[PDB]
Design an enzyme around this catalytic site. Structure first.
Site, PDB file in Angstrom:
ATOM      1  N   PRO C   1      21.783  -0.630  -5.321  1.00 16.81           N
ATOM      2  CA  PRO C   1      21.614  -1.702  -6.180  1.00 16.81           C
ATOM      3  C   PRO C   1      22.763  -2.579  -6.181  1.00 16.81           C
ATOM      4  O   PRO C   1      23.947  -2.319  -5.655  1.00 16.81           O
ATOM      5  CB  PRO C   1      21.532  -1.176  -7.662  1.00 16.81           C
ATOM      6  CG  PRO C   1      21.406   0.228  -7.432  1.00 16.81           C
ATOM      7  CD  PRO C   1      21.630   0.874  -6.046  1.00 16.81           C
ATOM      8  N   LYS C  32      20.605   6.293  -9.161  1.00 12.57           N
ATOM      9  CA  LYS C  32      20.966   5.998  -7.727  1.00 12.57           C
ATOM     10  C   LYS C  32      22.343   6.514  -7.206  1.00 12.57           C
ATOM     11  O   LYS C  32      23.184   6.754  -7.948  1.00 12.57           O
ATOM     12  CB  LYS C  32      21.001   4.665  -7.253  1.00 12.57           C
ATOM     13  CG  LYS C  32      19.566   3.815  -7.705  1.00 12.57           C
ATOM     14  CD  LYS C  32      18.633   4.220  -6.731  1.00 12.57           C
ATOM     15  CE  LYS C  32      17.160   3.221  -6.993  1.00 12.57           C
ATOM     16  NZ  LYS C  32      16.164   3.432  -6.188  1.00 12.57           N
ATOM     17  N   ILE C  64      15.707  -2.798  -4.964  1.00  9.00           N
ATOM     18  CA  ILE C  64      14.560  -2.410  -4.395  1.00  9.00           C
ATOM     19  C   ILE C  64      13.743  -1.684  -5.680  1.00  9.00           C
ATOM     20  O   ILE C  64      12.458  -1.884  -5.771  1.00  9.00           O
ATOM     21  CB  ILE C  64      14.609  -1.468  -3.280  1.00  9.00           C
ATOM     22  CG1 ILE C  64      15.018  -2.265  -1.909  1.00  9.00           C
ATOM     23  CG2 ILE C  64      13.232  -0.971  -2.929  1.00  9.00           C
ATOM     24  CD1 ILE C  64      15.219  -1.529  -0.783  1.00  9.00           C
TER      25      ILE C  64
HETATM   26  O1  7L9 Z   1      16.796   2.100   1.636  1.00 11.26           O
HETATM   27  C1  7L9 Z   1      17.696   1.856   2.638  1.00 11.26           C
HETATM   28  O2  7L9 Z   1      17.664   2.754   3.392  1.00 11.26           O
HETATM   29  C2  7L9 Z   1      18.522   0.764   2.577  1.00 11.26           C
HETATM   30  C3  7L9 Z   1      18.562   0.065   3.743  1.00 11.26           C
HETATM   31  C4  7L9 Z   1      19.555  -1.074   3.603  1.00 11.26           C
HETATM   32  C5  7L9 Z   1      20.082  -1.437   2.349  1.00 11.26           C
HETATM   33  C6  7L9 Z   1      19.816  -0.502   1.313  1.00 11.26           C
HETATM   34  C7  7L9 Z   1      20.151  -0.637  -0.032  1.00 11.26           C
HETATM   35  C8  7L9 Z   1      19.341  -0.996  -0.993  1.00 11.26           C
HETATM   36  C9  7L9 Z   1      19.835  -1.110  -2.258  1.00 11.26           C
HETATM   37  C10 7L9 Z   1      18.754  -1.513  -3.607  1.00 11.26           C
HETATM   38  O3  7L9 Z   1      17.896  -2.333  -3.167  1.00 11.26           O
HETATM   39  O4  7L9 Z   1      19.107  -1.237  -4.615  1.00 11.26           O
HETATM   40  N1  7L9 Z   1      20.913  -0.544  -2.808  1.00 11.26           N
HETATM   41  C11 7L9 Z   1      21.857  -0.152  -1.971  1.00 11.26           C
HETATM   42  C12 7L9 Z   1      21.633  -0.122  -0.322  1.00 11.26           C
HETATM   43  C13 7L9 Z   1      22.239   0.221   0.375  1.00 11.26           C
HETATM   44  O5  7L9 Z   1      22.013   1.211   1.142  1.00 11.26           O
HETATM   45  O6  7L9 Z   1      23.454   0.027   0.645  1.00 11.26           O
HETATM   46  C14 7L9 Z   1      18.940   0.451   1.399  1.00 11.26           C
END
Ligand code: 7L9
Ligand code: 7L9
Ligand code: 7L9
Lengths: 110, 110, 110
Positions: C1, C32, C64
């Site tokens: 996040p 998270k 997400i």
């Molecule tokens: O879900 C993944 O593998 C992925 C890939 C790229 C970025 C992110 C991600 C998404 C979120 C969120 O939407 O809360 N937070 C942190 C990340 C991250 O992995 O840095 C997640």
């Protein structure tokens, strides 16, 4: 509504109390009560607008009120350009405004 | 397009004119004319990225041009990581990019 | 996040390491892992919240994870108000939170 203003004007070159005058102006322009108006000014940033580093400002306006047509926002935009040109002595070409719709569920109060 | 870069690098540790080099790079990467490219750099912030407070940067890219697939943006992302790693001497794991679609009606000029 | 906190508290009035405590709190609140938590604090801004320039803070939370209902976010919001009121000695009426959904394609890592 939520107003966010970024500028490359140094903090000490931004008129004292701009956040207060922009709040009252925004309430009058957007037709919302002052107590629902939120303004953030972030001065002294490094900025390029339309490719150039002359003094400029970017204004974001976020509200439940935002209707996804140019015409619904054009009178609002015109007023905000008039406000910022006079407060920050910027030309019309040194300001850009972006409008973002919000829904009630996205806003957390308590 | 609208580029916003937040960093915990102090303003005096950010290369002179980064906003100009990022503007020209963005025009070349995104295939847009320089006079439609907007860059904001906000240095000296307190930041944690991937849970840590080592030097880092967050880049937001907003454009009518943004297509809602990973693959449409992956070549752009790769270029922006290459640009920021070399300018700010950050490792690949100290940068995150977020892409936001815009529509024409959201943009106020005049 | 992705957490973004704007405040009119001067940088030297913001508790040392707030970005670290907000990162760990956010991981616990949002359920998270800490290594996926991103926090940006921008202090010393000029701000009006609910029409007034008393000390305040605006928190944006992008993930997400964000579900487009008040109730899905209300327990999260309650925790973030409790965190910010105690860290920044703000009343409940001096904080506003905004929640923004993201999709995976919008996030660029590498
Ligand atoms: O879900 C993944 O593998 C992925 C890939 C790229 C970025 C992110 C991600 C998404 C979120 C969120 O939407 O809360 N937070 C942190 C990340 C991250 O992995 O840095 C997640
Ligand atoms: O409509 C409400 O009662 C309500 C609840 C939470 C936040 C807001 C709100 C919405 C907007 C806007 O979208 O323009 N602006 C200010 C507020 C607020 O009450 O602070 C409004
Ligand atoms: O397409 C236009 O004519 C037009 C009108 C207003 C603003 C913009 C615009 C859009 C973008 C973008 O979404 O990437 N970037 C720059 C501009 C601009 O002309 O400043 C473009």
């Amino acid at each position: 509504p939520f107003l966010e203003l970024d500028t490359n004007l140094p903090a000490n070159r931004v008129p004292a109390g701009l956040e207060k005058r922009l709040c009252a102006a925004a309430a009058s322009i957007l037709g919302k009560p002052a107590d629902r108006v939120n303004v953030t000014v972030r001065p002294g940033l490094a900025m390029a607008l339309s490719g150039s580093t002359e003094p400029c400002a970017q204004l974001s306006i976020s509200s439940i009120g935002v209707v996804g047509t140019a015409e619904d926002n054009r009178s609002h935009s015109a007023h905000f350009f008039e406000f910022l040109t006079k407060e920050l002595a910027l030309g019309q070409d040194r300001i850009l405004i972006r409008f973002f719709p919000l829904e009630s569920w996205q806003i957390g109060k308590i």
